[PDB]
């Protein structure tokens, strides 16, 4: 299928005392495998997936020394932005980072991502192409030059389509059972009070869409189970009750199931 | 497999 690798971050100002916190977890096609939390008691990289385990010891600290330096940077960032903001410094502000890259069923590089944000709205980003960035406002805007006179932006290009992907198949190769199989969702449907929804069961990966149709509809964000599987249901309003048909399809399934009953 | 370097906003 189509696979990928990502690393999510979140750093947050805390003026009072405070706690400039920093979580770090990464995802292989929406599978947890990494961990770096400051308020914790390890100050390292902890395993979370039963396949991260194998790499050597200096891999792990080959990785703690970095999320370490990721963290200390957003100390500056968090305390740099306000320079735009002229804000209070008795306020808890938030910065999230986001860089990554994907690869088709080719196993060869495809697209590449790199975006920052603050307040939960877009700050700066890196387009499809790796020449050039995305400016949101004038604050996010200033940053650009020193990513545009120093060229630091320029390199990520060496790493994303180069270093990143080989890491991904370093991961995928020995990730075979718990990273790259197709979980077929099982289905049921129910009726009460009338209201009809047809549920989908225990499916990987994340993205599915189910829907109904012609012979005012409630549904829900995907829910994680904890088994590395997922959830969704589709509240649709209908007495006579043969009604509509649920359109269920995702890669796991041979082709879209139809069952009105 | 992460960024071996880091830049400051």
């Amino acid at each position, epitope marked *: 299928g189509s696979h990928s690798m990502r690393y999510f971050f979140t750093s947050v100002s805390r003026p009072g005392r405070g706690e400039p916190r920093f979580i770090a977890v990464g995802y292989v096609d929406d599978t947890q495998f990494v961990r770096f939390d400051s308020d914790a008691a390890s100050q390292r990289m902890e395993p979370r997936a039963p396949w991260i385990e194998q790499e050597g010891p200096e891999y792990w600290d080959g990785e703690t*020394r970095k999320v*370490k*330096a990721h963290s*200390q*940077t957003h100390r*500056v960032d968090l305390g740099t932005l306000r320079g735009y903001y002229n804000q209070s410094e008795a306020g808890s502000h938030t910065v999230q980072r986001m860089y990554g890259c994907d690869v088709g069923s080719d196993w060869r590089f495809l697209r590449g991502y790199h975006q920052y944000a603050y307040d939960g709205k877009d700050y700066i980003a890196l387009k499809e192409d790796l020449r050039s960035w995305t400016a949101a406002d004038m604050a996010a805007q200033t940053t650009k030059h*020193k*990513w545009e*006179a*120093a*060229h*630091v932006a*320029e*390199q990520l*290009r*060496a*790493y994303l389509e*180069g*270093t990143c992907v080989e890491w991904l198949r370093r991961y995928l190769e020995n990730g075979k059972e718990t990273l790259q199989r197709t979980d077929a969702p099982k289905t049921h449907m129910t009726h009460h009070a009338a209201t009809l929804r047809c549920w989908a069961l225990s499916f990987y990966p994340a993205e599915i869409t189910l829907t109904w149709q012609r012979d005012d509809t409630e549904l829900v964000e995907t829910r994680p189970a904890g088994d590395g599987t997922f959830q969704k249901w589709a509240a649709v309003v209908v007495g006579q009750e043969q009604r509509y048909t649920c359109h269920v399809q995702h890669e796991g399934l041979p082709k879209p199931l139809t069952l009105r009953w | 497999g992460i*960024l*071996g*370097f*880091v*830049f*400051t906003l």
Partner: T-cell receptor
Amino acid sequence: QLNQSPQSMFIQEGEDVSMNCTSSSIFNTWLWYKQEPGEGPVLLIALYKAGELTSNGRLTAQFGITRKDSFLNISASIPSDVGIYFCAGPGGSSNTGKLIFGQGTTLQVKP
Amino acid sequence: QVTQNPRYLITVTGKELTVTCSQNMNHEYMSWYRQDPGLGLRQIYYSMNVEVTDKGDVPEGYKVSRKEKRNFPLILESPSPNQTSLYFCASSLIYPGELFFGEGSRLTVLE
């Protein structure tokens, strides 16, 4: 390692001169520095994309489309340009913050 | 300008040294290099911004630290004849960038 050639070169007043880098890893940034004895390295030309960069020069710096070696010529030699010449390529595929410099060719100009 | 303390001195096997280099203004990524006739420039230890300890290629016989920006020291627990060279302390605000090398501090270690 980042290689460089020739060992050391001895041209005359008037002649042309040609040096080159060759790396092992893939670089997208190629920088030529020069230091005259006793001082720090000083940036001469920087290259970012494949294709040429004429500036400053006199000079002409090339980006090998291999993304794995570059070139530096100097036309109409002048004794004012004696020095140790370098190629800096901030790796890079290394996934480190390293700034790799070469062997460095020593130019000397007999007028 | 980056100031290099001290510009030239001598010592003996076993007695530690501390070569501090100043900084302005509010640059972040600085490293220390080594050079001698022969192999030319190489990189020893470097640190992007503050408190980021990163080794690099020629380490042994060295160590380093930095908890604030303005100063950056390379210390040596056991000067041995291998480290008799010519050290440089270059400077720029972010990785990568053009570097601002120093005067030229040279330490000579004797038996």
